[PDB]
Amino acid sequence: AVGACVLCNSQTSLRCGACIRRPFLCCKCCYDHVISTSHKLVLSVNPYVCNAPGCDVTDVTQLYLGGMSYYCKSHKPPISFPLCANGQVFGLYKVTDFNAIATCDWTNAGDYILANTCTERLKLFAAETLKATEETFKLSYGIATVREVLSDRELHLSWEVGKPRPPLNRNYVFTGYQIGEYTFEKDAVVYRGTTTYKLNVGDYFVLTSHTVMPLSAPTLVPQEHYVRITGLYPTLNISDEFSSNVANYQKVGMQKYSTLQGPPGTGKSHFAIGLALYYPSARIVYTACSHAAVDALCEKALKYLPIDKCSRIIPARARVECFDKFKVNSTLEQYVFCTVNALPETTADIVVFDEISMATNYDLSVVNARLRAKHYVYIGDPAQLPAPRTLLTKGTLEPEYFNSVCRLMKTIGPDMFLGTCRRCPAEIVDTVSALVYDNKLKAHKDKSAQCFKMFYKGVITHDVSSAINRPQIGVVREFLTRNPAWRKAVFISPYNSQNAVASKILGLPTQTVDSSQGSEYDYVIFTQTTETAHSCNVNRFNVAITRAKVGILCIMSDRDLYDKLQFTSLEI
Numbered sequence: 001a002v003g004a005c006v007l008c009n010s011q012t013s014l015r016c017g018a019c020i021r022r023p024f025l026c027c028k029c030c031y032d033h034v035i036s037t038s039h040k041l042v043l044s045v046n047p048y049v050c051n052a053p054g055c056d057v058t059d060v061t062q063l064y065l066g067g068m069s070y071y072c073k074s075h076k077p078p079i080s081f082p083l084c085a086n087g088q089v090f091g092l093y094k095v096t097d098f099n100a101i102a103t104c105d106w107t108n109a110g111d112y113i114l115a116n117t118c119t120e121r122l123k124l125f126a127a128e129t130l131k132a133t134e135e136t137f138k139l140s141y142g143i144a145t146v147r148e149v150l151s152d153r154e155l156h157l158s159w160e161v162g163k164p165r166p167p168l169n170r171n172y173v174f175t176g177y178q179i180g181e182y183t184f185e186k187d188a189v190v191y192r193g194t195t196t197y198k199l200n201v202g203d204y205f206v207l208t209s210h211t212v213m214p215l216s217a218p219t220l221v222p223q224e225h226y227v228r229i230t231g232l233y234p235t236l237n238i239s240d241e242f243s244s245n246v247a248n249y250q251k252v253g254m255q256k257y258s259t260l261q262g263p264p265g266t267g268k269s270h271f272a273i274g275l276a277l278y279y280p281s282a283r284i285v286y287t288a289c290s291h292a293a294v295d296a297l298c299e300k301a302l303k304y305l306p307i308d309k310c311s312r313i314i315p316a317r318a319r320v321e322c323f324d325k326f327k328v329n330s331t332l333e334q335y336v337f338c339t340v341n342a343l344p345e346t347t348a349d350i351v352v353f354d355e356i357s358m359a360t361n362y363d364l365s366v367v368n369a370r371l372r373a374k375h376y377v378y379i380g381d382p383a384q385l386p387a388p389r390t391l392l393t394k395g396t397l398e399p400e401y402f403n404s405v406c407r408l409m410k411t412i413g414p415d416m417f418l419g420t421c422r423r424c425p426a427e428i429v430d431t432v433s434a435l436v437y438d439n440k441l442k443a444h445k446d447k448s449a450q451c452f453k454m455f456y457k458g459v460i461t462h463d464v465s466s467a468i469n470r471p472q473i474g475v476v477r478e479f480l481t482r483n484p485a486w487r488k489a490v491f492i493s494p495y496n497s498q499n500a501v502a503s504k505i506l507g508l509p510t511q512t513v514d515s516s517q518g519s520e521y522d523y524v525i526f527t528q529t530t531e532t533a534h535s536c537n538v539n540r541f542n543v544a545i546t547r548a549k550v551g552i553l554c555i556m557s558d559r560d561l562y563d564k565l566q567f568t569s570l571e572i
């Protein structure tokens with residue numbers, strides 16, 4: 001129990017017994033915590049509890065030191081000293097924000113705002129506390145035992161009574177029993193088991209509650225600016241392809257860490273891989289939270305970098321199918337592509353952390369702890385979607401509060417900005433540029449004249465909380481008959497249930513706005529479904545319409561976002 005204070009690093013025997021993470025608190029700051037919160041249990045080698053037999057006094061403000069032992073007001077000897085006095089809690093080696101992080105339930109937006117505006121040590125305390133809270137919340141759900149196997153992709157479930165049911169969507173990954181991880185979608189239920197094992201009747205699934213490890217490394221290392229490119233060796237033979245990024249690659253070598261805001265289709269993956277061509281001797285570790293983001297970096301590297309110097313790091317618990325074209329699990333390769341949670345303990349000349357809006361401060365810290373690099377590059381877009389915060393139910397999380405990197409990008413601005421969108425028709429670029437990019441995003445493509453909008457509220461039904469709008473899907477069906485080229489479109493909506501219905505009625509491939517992030521398609525059909533805060537969220541709206549390379553049909557519910565759309569309006 002010998003440690004350093006989470007608020008002023010002073011060595012202490014004291015560690016708050018009422019905090020879920022039991023943080024070490026020094027004498028002077030353990031006091032401010034206990035005297036202004038419900039937290040009154042103080043721990044040491046021997047905790048602060050009345051030593052008298054059968055006494056239940058554990059509140060440090062009601063305890064005293066009687067020689068070498070502790071007692072309450074009823075058991076103390078005449079020569080005793082209160083543990084709480086003169087703004088201190090008695091201990092060896094003798095705050096409003098810390099109190100809020102230590103006591104909050106993580107269901108309010110203001111809890112995440114604070115977890116991002118506090119000191120660096122408090123950012124790690126908040127991240128550790130939040131993740132531990134998110135995990136103890138998984139224990140708080142109902143178990144599902146298999147009743148009958150219908151076919152190879154459909155089954156029927158019997159749920160635990162008296163305990164709430166977790167959301168049936170592609171946002172909750174169960175763990176069957178040890179039959180591998182399983183997922184569920186909209187009595188006919190759809191089963192997506194990662195391991196192809198015939199779901200035996202009787203076997204059960206349970207949500208993967210994993211232990212929350214302590215954070216040590218900061219979310220962002222201290223920033224250093226250099227006068228020359230440091231530890232990196234540039235090429236004078238850089239292909240014209242990557243010529244536009246030379247000044248930004250140099251900026252990368254002249255700073256400890258750099259932020260790159262790249263709107264959709266502005267060249268983030270091209271920049272990340274071109275940085276390897278600009279410093280061809282540099283060992284680069286490419287990291288992101290999801291397997292999809294790591295795989296998209298692998299795809300771009302396959303085109304520009306030598307395959308024998310690349311390696312895809314895949315964990316022993318190989319959860320889903322990922323990139324198969326690099327030598328698997330060779331940690332020593334010049335180019336290492338691996339997700340944040342599977343990162344080995346290694347060093348690099350550059351670490352590239354892609355899709356930074358999806359990172360949490362927990363992820364940021366983990367990367368700083370497993371990777372010791374000369375340079376760190378954070379690539380993403382605060383105008384895109386953040387990681388879902390399962391506990392957050394009240395208020396909206398603004399982009400400046402997604403993580404430490406997003407906070408910098410939204411407050412001081414990003415170090416580098418990719419200003420030309422090359423993917424989208426100009427109608428889409430013009431709309432999102434004005435919506436979330438302060439008119440700084442430019443279109444490379446001309447208008448496609450294939451970007452349409454229809455204002456149609458329809459009828460909103462629900463499958464628990466996931467929404468469905470059958471009339472909006474009906475309008476899409478009518479549109480498809482009159483527009484056969486749209487037969488190849490991807491159907492996108494903010495709700496899994498809407499997508500399940502559209503898959504059956506339209507036969508189009510389906511994506512939620514959140515799973516479409518990072519992907520692109522020629523044609524996109526978007527139904528807004530509802531006018532909720534979820535479906536009207538400007539970041540989600542931005543991701544949704546920026547998936548299209550050629551055309552987009554938007555069936556809207558919200559007048560505001562419909563009027564912003566610089567698309568041709570349709571009637572019916």
Ligand SMILES: CC(=O)Nc1cc(C(=O)O)ccc1F
Nearest residue numbers: 241244265266267269270422
């Ligand atoms: C290859 C690729 O990803 N495309 C791309 C390249 C540039 C550029 O050459 O500046 C800019 C934006 C882009 F989306």
Ligand SMILES: [Zn+2]
Nearest residue numbers: 005008026029
């Ligand atoms: Zn302290």
Ligand SMILES: [Zn+2]
Nearest residue numbers: 016018019039
């Ligand atoms: Zn506490």
Ligand SMILES: [Zn+2]
Nearest residue numbers: 050055072075
């Ligand atoms: Zn007592």
